[PDB]
Amino acid sequence: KTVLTYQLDGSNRDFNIPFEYLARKFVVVTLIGVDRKVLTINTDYRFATRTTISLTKAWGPADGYTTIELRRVTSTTDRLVDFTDGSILRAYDLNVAQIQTMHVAEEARDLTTDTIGVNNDGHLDARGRRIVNLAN
Amino acid sequence: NVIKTVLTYQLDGSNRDFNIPFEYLARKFVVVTLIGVDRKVLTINTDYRFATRTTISLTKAWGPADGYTTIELRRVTSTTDRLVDFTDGSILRAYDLNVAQIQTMHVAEEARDLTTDTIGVNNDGHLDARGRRIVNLANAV
Amino acid sequence: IKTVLTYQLDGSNRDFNIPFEYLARKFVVVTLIGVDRKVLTINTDYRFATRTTISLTKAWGPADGYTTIELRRVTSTTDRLVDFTDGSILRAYDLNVAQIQTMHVAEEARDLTTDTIGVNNDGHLDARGRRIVN
Amino acid sequence: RSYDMNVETAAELSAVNDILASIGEPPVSTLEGDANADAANARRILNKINRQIQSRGWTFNIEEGITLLPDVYSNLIVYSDDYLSLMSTSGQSIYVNRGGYVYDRTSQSDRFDSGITVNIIRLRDYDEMPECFRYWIVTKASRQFNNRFFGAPEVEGVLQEEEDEARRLCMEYEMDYGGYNMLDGDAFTSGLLTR
C-alpha cells in the first residue's frame, strides 16, 4: 500500500512509513483535520531514518488535524535515472529505472480504489455512501 | 478507455476455447475465473489449458446450468517479482532489456485498465459494474 | 499536469492547447463529447498547428450536437516505440524513451479518476447523470 | 530464454526494419528523435506507399454510401487531404476538390443543406491493412527505398520480382474478399436471370 494514516493524540513524532520510496520528495505528509494541511519537509518533519519520519510538534487531536496521512507521490515528469552515453551502465540504474514507473503504477492502483473498489468477495465494496444523481 | 487486459466472454455451456488478445510474459500472469453467482478462479493444468499462446482451452464446458454466465481472462503481472534483474557482471542482452521494459509496461497497463476493479465508463456513456454486486450500499434515501 | 482535459465547445473557436507531453501524435486522442461521443481523425477533422495546439478543420458546437471536446493522452502499451535488437548499439536514447513510454502509461494510470464516479463534498458517490449497468 | 512469452512488436518499426534490411542495413531499435535520415526516409516512403496502394481501391477499403455532413453555418463539406478517392455512389461523379472543400461541378456550388452520400476511400493506418497488403506495401516501399537511397541494380531486379508476387497475392485477397459473381452478384445480369 502507498497510503497509510496514524492517529496519535499523545506526544509522538515517529511514524514508520510502510511504502518504499525513491526520493524524499515522493513522500508527502498531510494533516487530516477539518481541512487538510500540506506540510513542508524542513520545518515540519525530519527523516530520522529511511523507514521512520519524525514529525516535529505533537499535532494531536488536541488540534483539529487528529490523524496524519503518509502519501507516496512519485514524480512522473522527473526521472531519477537518466541514461547518458559515455556513462557506465550500472545494474543499479537499470533496475531503479523500472522501479520508478512501477511505483507510479502502485500509486495508481490505490487512487482509483479510493473512491470505490472491489473487496475480497469479488464485489464492489461501498463504504456506506448513497449513489446520488443516479439516472434511471 | 476500453480495457485491453481484461477479456470476458459469454459462457454457452458448449464452448471451451477462448481467445487471449493481450500480451503476457508468463502463463501464470493469465488468470482464468468463471463469473456467475460467485467468481471461481481456475487452475492452470486441471481446469484449463494453453492450447496455443493466444487460446485457452477449458477442460470442462461451463454454462448457466453450472451457474456461470461468463468467463474472464485477465492479465495480472507480478509487481514484487521482476522477471529480469540486472547484475554487475552480466552481459547486457536485447532480450533482457525487452523483457524488463515490457513487464513495466504491463504493470502500468494493468494499472491504467483498473476501471474493471471499480465503476468506470464503458464504451457507451454508462458507468459499468461489469456483472458484480455493489455490496454494502445499505440504506438509501 | 493532467493527461486528460476537456474544453467547452463554441462555433467561434477551433484551437485547443495540449498541456501534456506526448511521445507521438497518435498518442493524443481527440473526442467530441455531447449526446454522442465521436473520435476525430488526425487530418480530416483536425491537425497539429503547433506541437502544443490542435486546430480543427471544422468548427463544432451545440448546433452540431457536441458541447465539449476532450484532449486525452493514450500512450500505446502494445506498440512500443523502442524494441532492442540483438547486435545493435545500445544507445542511452533508446533506454530513456523506453522508460518514458512506460512512465506515460503509468501517468495516465493515475488519471482514471475522470473516468470514474468520484466523490462529492458530502462524501457520496456522484453519478454525473449516468446509469449504472451490470 | 526462459518463460513461454506472448508479446508483440510495433508493425511500423518492423516494416521500417524490413525496408532497411532490403538494402542490407542493420535494424534500428526506434523510429523517433528526428536525427536519423534512414528512419526519416524509410518511414516517409512507407507512408507514401501505404497511401498510394490504399488509393487504388479495394473492396475492403472502398466505403460505399458514406455520408459527409456539411458545416451547419457555412454549409461547407471539407474535402480532406486524407480522402484518397471520393466518388458518387452511382453513375458519373459530381464532386471535386475546390480549395479544400467539396464542390459540386454540375451545380457549381460548395453549399450543401444536407449531407451528401459518396463512395469514399479514407486513409487507414498500416496496422489496419491485411497481412498481404502489409507485405505488398513493405515490398513496394523496400523497392523505392533501394531505387532512391541505395541504387543497387541487382537489388532492383530482386525487389521487382518480390513486388510482382506481393501484388499477385493482394489480388487473390481482393477476389476472395470481394466474392464477386457475374450471374447473381452482377448488377445487370441478375435482373436478366428472372423467369
Place this chain on the structure above:
Amino acid sequence: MRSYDMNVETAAELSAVNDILASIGEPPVSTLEGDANADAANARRILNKINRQIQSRGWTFNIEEGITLLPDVYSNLIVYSDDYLSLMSTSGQSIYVNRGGYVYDRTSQSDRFDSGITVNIIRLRDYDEMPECFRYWIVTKASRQFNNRFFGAPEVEGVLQEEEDEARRLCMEYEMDYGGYNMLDGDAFTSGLLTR
C-alpha cells in the same frame, strides 16, 4: 506483430536459421540466443517475415472455416489481432475489416457485436507447426531473400530461385493431396447438378 525472438528456441527454428545462414556460407550457430550475431539476427527476422507471408497466402490445412470470434460482453468488441493473417466471410462478399485493432462491420458501419461472428480466418502459427514441405519452402524463400539483401551473390540468387520454385511446387502438391478436391461431388455447384 508477434515477436519471433522472445520465446524459447525450438530445434526446427534453430535448424531453419542455420539453413538460412548456410545459404550465404555462414557457419551454423549453436543457439538462437543473443550473441551479437548480426547475421543470425537478420536470418531470424527474414525467417519470421517469410513465415508470416506464406501462411497468409491461404491453404486448406491453415484456413480455418466457420470459426467463431467472440466479443467482450461489456464492450461488445471483437479484437482483430495482428496475428489474423486473413479474415473473411464464410460465404459471399466479406463484410469485416480492421478498424483500430477491432473487427468492424463495414456494411453495417458498426464495431459492436452482441454475439460471436463466424469467419473464415487464417491465424499465425509457429514455424514448428508447419508441414515439412511448407517448412522447406519457408526456409528456401527466407534463404533466397537473405542472400539477396545481405550478400547479393548472383550465382546463389539463381540457384535459390530454382529451389524456391521447386519448394513451392512441392507445397502445391501437398495442398492438393491434403485438399482432396473434387469438381464432381466435392463441388459447391456441380454436386447439386448430379442428382437424378
Place this chain on the structure above:
Amino acid sequence: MRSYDMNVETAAELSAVNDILASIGEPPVSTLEGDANADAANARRILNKINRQIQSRGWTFNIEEGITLLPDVYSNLIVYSDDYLSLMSTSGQSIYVNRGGYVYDRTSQSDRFDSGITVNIIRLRDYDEMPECFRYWIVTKASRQFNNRFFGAPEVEGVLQEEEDEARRLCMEYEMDYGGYNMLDGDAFTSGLLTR
C-alpha cells in the same frame, strides 16, 4: 503563367517536392522557403510544370463544361488567362482562340462580346486540389523528369519510367470510375437510337 513559388507552402506541396528530391537521393527539406537550395527550387519548377501538363490533358473531374465567361461591360473583352489550360466550345468545332490575352472569335473575327460566352474550359488548379492518384502521377512524372535533367542516372530512369506508366494507369482507372461512361444510354448518339 501562375507563380508556383510565391504563395505559402502546403503540406502536400512540401511532400511532393521532397518526393521529387528523393528520386535522385536528396534528403527532404523542412520548408520550400528560400534556403539557396538549388535542387529544391528546381524540383518545385518541374513540379509546377508537370502539374500544368497533366491537368491540361483533360479529365472528367477537371473539365468544366457549360462555363460562362463574362465580358467587361465597358470594354466587351473576355480575358484569356494563362491559367486557361484548355478552352473549347461546348459542342462542335471550337471558335475561340487567344489573341493578345483576350478571347477572340476566329469565325466572326471579333474580340468584343456583349454577353458571356459558354465554353468547355480547363482552369489550372492547385496540386493540393488534385485527386490522390493524380497527385502521385504528377510527382512520379516530375521525379522522372527531375532525374533526367539534373542527375541523369540510367537505373533511376528505368524504374521511374515503369512507375509513371503504373501511375498513369491508375489515373486512367480513376478517370473511368469517375466518368461512369456508358455507350448505350450515356452515349450522345446511341441513347436516341434506343427509343422504341
Place this chain on the structure above:
Amino acid sequence: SKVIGLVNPAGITQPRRLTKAQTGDFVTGRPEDISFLQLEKQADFTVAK
C-alpha cells in the same frame, strides 16, 4: 455447366468494376486478364461418344 470466371491476379481487370457495371458501361481492364475455366476432355469425349 458451371461458369467460373478466372481472373488473372497479375492483370489489371477488377471484377468489382465488372459486376457493378451496367450494360454498355466503359470499364478499365483487358480481355486477356479475364478467362473461364473450361473442361478440356474433347479427345476423351469423342472416344467415349
